[PDB]
């Protein structure tokens, strides 16, 4: 995530949006409003930089 | 013209020094009041 500031000629890095990968994706528990909770059938959430 | 001495609009001192507070009375009260007006 980079943001441009007026006057500055270079974007400033704010943060990395990390993606969580599961080894069994179907086993996540749907809370409702577009959210999934980890489950014993879908354990070990792996937080990785997107693309790797 | 600009060197002619002049009296400013606001004459006198432009600041005032605080006067030190009155000596507290030896009565057993924390509340001490200055001379009321």
């Amino acid at each position: 995530v980079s943001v441009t500031q007026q006057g500055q000629a270079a974007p400033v890095q704010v943060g990395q949006l990390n993606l969580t990968t599961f080894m069994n994706d179907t086993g996540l528990e749907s809370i409702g409003e577009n959210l999934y909770i980890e489950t014993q059938s879908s354990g070990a959430p792996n937080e990785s930089t997107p693309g790797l | 013209c600009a060197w002619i001495p002049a009296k400013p609009l606001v004459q006198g001192a432009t600041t005032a020094q605080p006067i030190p507070g009155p000596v507290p009375v030896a009565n057993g009260s924390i509340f001490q009041s200055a001379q009321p007006i």
């Binding site: - | 030896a26 057993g28 009260s29 924390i30």
Partner: protein, 303 residues
């Protein structure tokens, strides 16, 4: 042991101390800290004082910290090292202070000077108030007040209630016990007492005076009415005059007009008023109407 219960000694008085503090150790019942910025601001101040600098731009959402106000009483002749009780009251949107601990709190006087330091564990009843607590010996005295006790040969006893008769009685008792010109009366509330010069001698004089017994003369008739709590209290001097009383849904146990007899003592007054069969809320209106008419020979005070 009545003079000590009827008067106070001049210069022997209590002061009030106030301060601000933080209470920690709550079980998720502290400040929300989103509607109370001062809680987080003062926590950051404390951390900075202790050596931890939290960056200014950061979201701090606490649950175990509550900003509280601490109140205490500065006793007469207080000395540094002595301990006093404090009251701790929550200030904003906190839910409970049941198992909290009060951190170092300086208790300021009216002159904004530190006279005590407060720190301890709160005791909360737990129908019971949850946002208020008390800490026994929670504050240590740090400053001492100068006083004029022991200087001069005059000390004033100040009556709790103004009365010329009671002032004269106290003066006469002191004169009967400790010589001719030992005490004089200045007004309905103050009795001037002559004491020997020094500190120990005046303490001895006050020790002899304080436990003296004085027979209390009869006070003014007074009926105290508390409409907020719904109570009526009549002292022993209340009398009644004969007159008729009528009020809604009240009748002779018959007609709506009921006679009230002339009453001299309190038992007669109580009997006459109980013959009316009036609820205390009805008795309040009855008493006010009788005071307006003139049957009630007493001072009606609404508190």
């Amino acid at each position: 042991e009545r003079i000590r219960d009827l008067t106070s000694v001049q210069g022997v008085r209590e002061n009030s101390l106030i301060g601000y503090g933080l209470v920690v150790g709550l079980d998720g019942t502290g400040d929300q800290t989103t509607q109370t910025p001062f809680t987080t601001q003062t926590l950051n101040n404390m951390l900075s004082q202790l050596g931890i600098t939290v960056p200014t731009g950061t979201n701090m959402q606490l649950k175990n910290v509550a900003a509280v106000m601490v109140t205490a009483s500065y006793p007469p002749f207080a000395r540094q090292g002595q301990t006093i009780d404090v009251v701790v009251s929550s200030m904003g949107n906190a839910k409970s202070l049941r198992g909290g601990t009060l951190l170092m709190t300086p208790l300021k006087g009216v002159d904004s000077q530190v006279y005590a330091l407060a720190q301890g564990n709160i005791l909360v009843g737990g129908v019971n108030q949850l946002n208020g607590g008390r800490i026994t010996n929670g504050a240590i005295i740090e400053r001492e007040l100068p006083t004029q006790f022991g200087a001069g040969n005059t000390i004033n006893l100040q009556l709790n209630d103004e009365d010329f008769t009671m002032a004269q009685q106290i003066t006469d008792a002191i004169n009967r016990a400790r010589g001719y010109g030992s005490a004089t009366a200045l007004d309905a509330r103050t009795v001037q007492v002559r004491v020997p010069s020094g500190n120990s001698s005046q303490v001895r004089f006050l020790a002899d005076i304080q436990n003296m017994e004085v027979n209390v003369t009869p006070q003014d008739a007074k009926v105290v009415i508390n409409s907020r709590t719904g109570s009526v209290v009549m002292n022993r001097e209340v009398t009644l005059d004969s007159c008729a009383v009528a009020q809604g849904n009240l009748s002779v146990t018959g007609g709506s007009l009921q006679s009230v007899r002339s009453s001299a003592n309190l038992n007669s007054v109580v009997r006459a008023l109980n013959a009316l069969g009036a609820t205390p809320m009805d008795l309040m209106s009855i008493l006010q109407s009788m005071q307006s008419a003139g049957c009630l020979r007493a001072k009606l005070e609404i508190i």
